[PDB]
Design a protein around this ligand. Structure first.
Ligand SMILES: Nc1nc2c(ncn2[C@@H]2O[C@H](CO)[C@@H](O)[C@H]2O)c(=O)[nH]1
Ligand SMILES: Nc1nc2c(ncn2[C@@H]2O[C@H](CO)[C@@H](O)[C@H]2O)c(=O)[nH]1
Length: 280
C-alpha cells in the first residue's frame, strides 16, 4: 500500500538518475516500475569542498545518498579510510543495520552533487532481503581466492549484487561469439571451456570448478566471447551482472588481468595476438 513521495524531474534527470541506480548494487534486484518510483522520490543535494554529508555519531541523518559527480572521503576515528566516487552511495550502512552514522563523509572535490532518498522509501521499496542475501554469500566470498583483495566492505558490496544460478549437466553457461552479460563464480560443480581453433572448430581448453571465475575476459578487453562455457555437472554459481562488474570487482581487476600470464589462458593469449574477436 506504500505510496512514495514524488518530485517531478526533467526527462534527462530521470534518465541520469535511472542510470546511477542500475549501476549501484543497492538497487540490483528491483523491477522497472520500482526503479522509476525510486527515481521520482530522489531529490537533488549539492555540497561544497570540505562539507560533511554526515558525521560519525550522528543520529539525525537517516538518508541514503547516491553520488552523481564528485568525490568524498570516509573517515573513521580521524583517519581517512575510503574514497567514494561517482555512482557510489553513503548512508546505506545506517539504513540497513539501524545504527548511528559509523563514519564521517567529507567532500574532497570542489562540488559534490548527490541524489538523496528518504529512509521510508528505501526500507519499503528497496532493501528487500538485503541482509539474507549478504548471509547467503559472504562466507563463501571470503573464501574465494581471486576476491582476496576486497575488504569486508567490498565483499558485502559484491554480495548485494549476487544471485544464484544453477546449470544442468551439458547446459551452456556461455555461448561462443555472444556479448555476454554475466561473470560467474562457481560454488558447486565443474565446467568446460570450449574454444575455437584456427579452422574454426571446437577445441576443449580446460575445466573449471569451485572458486573459479568465468565471464571476465570480455569485460576486461571489450570483445565478444571467444569460448563456450558448458556445465559438465549440475552447477551452482553466484552471478554478477556486467553493469556491476567495475563498481564491485574494481580492486581485483588486476588479479583478473593475470589472464595475460597464466598458461590456462594460453588459448586466449593466442586468440588475442591474432585479433580473433569483436567488441560488445
Ligand atoms: N568503503 C567503506 N565505506 C564505509 C565504511 N563505513 C562506512 N562507510 C560509508 O560511510 C557511510 C557512513 O558511515 C556509510 O553509509 C557507508 O557508505 C567502511 O568501512 N568502508
Ligand atoms: N581457463 C581459460 N578460460 C577461458 C579462456 N578463454 C576463454 N575462457 C573463458 O571463457 C569465457 C568466454 O570467452 C571467458 O570469459 C573465460 O571465462 C582460456 O584461454 N583459458
Amino acid at each position: 500500500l506504500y505510496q512514495a513521495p514524488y518530485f517531478e524531474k526533467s526527462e534527462d534527470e530521470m534518465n541520469l538518475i535511472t542510470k546511477l541506480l542500475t549501476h549501484n548494487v543497492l538497487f540490483s534486484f528491483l523491477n522497472t516500475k520500482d526503479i522509476k518510483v525510486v527515481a521520482g522520490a530522489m531529490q537533488r543535494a549539492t555540497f561544497k569542498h570540505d562539507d560533511c554529508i554526515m558525521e560519525a555519531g550522528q543520529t539525525t541523518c537517516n538518508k541514503l545518498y547516491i553520488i552523481q559527480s564528485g568525490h568524498a572521503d570516509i573517515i573513521k576515528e580521524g583517519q581517512k579510510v575510503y574514497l567514494k566516487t561517482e555512482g557510489t552511495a553513503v548512508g546505506e550502512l545506517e539504513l540497513m543495520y539501524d545504527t548511528p552514522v559509523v563514519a564521517t563523509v567529507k567532500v574532497c572535490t570542489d562540488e559534490l552533487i548527490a541524489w538523496v532518498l528518504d529512509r521510508d522509501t528505501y526500507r519499503n521499496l528497496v532493501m528487500g532481503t538485503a541482509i539474507r542475501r549478504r548471509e547467503t554469500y559472504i562466507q563463501f566470498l571470503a573464501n574465494v581466492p581471486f576476491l582476496g583483495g576486497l575488504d569486508s566492505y567490498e565483499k558485502l558490496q559484491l554480495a548485494d549484487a549476487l544471485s544464484s544460478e544453477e546449470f544442468s549437466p551439458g547446459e551452456y553457461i556461455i555461448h561462443y561469439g555472444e556479448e555476454g552479460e554475466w561473470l560467474y563464480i562457481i560454488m558447486e560443480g565443474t565446467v568446460e571451456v570450449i574454444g575455437r581453433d584456427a579452422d574454426g572448430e571446437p577445441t576443449k581448453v580446460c575445466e573449471f570448478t569451485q572458486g573459479d571465475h568465468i565471464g571476465e575476459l570480455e569485460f576486461l578487453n571489450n570483445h565478444r566471447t571467444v569460448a563456450d562455457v558448458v556445465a559438465t555437472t549440475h552447477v551452482i554459481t553466484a552471478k554478477l551482472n556486467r553493469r556491476h562488474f567495475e563498481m564491485c570487482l574494481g580492486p581485483v581487476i588486476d588479479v583478473l588481468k593475470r589472464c595475460a600470464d597464466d598458461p590456462k589462458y594460453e588459448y586466449y593469449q593466442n586468440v588475442l595476438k591474432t585479433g580473433a574477436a569483436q567488441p560488445s
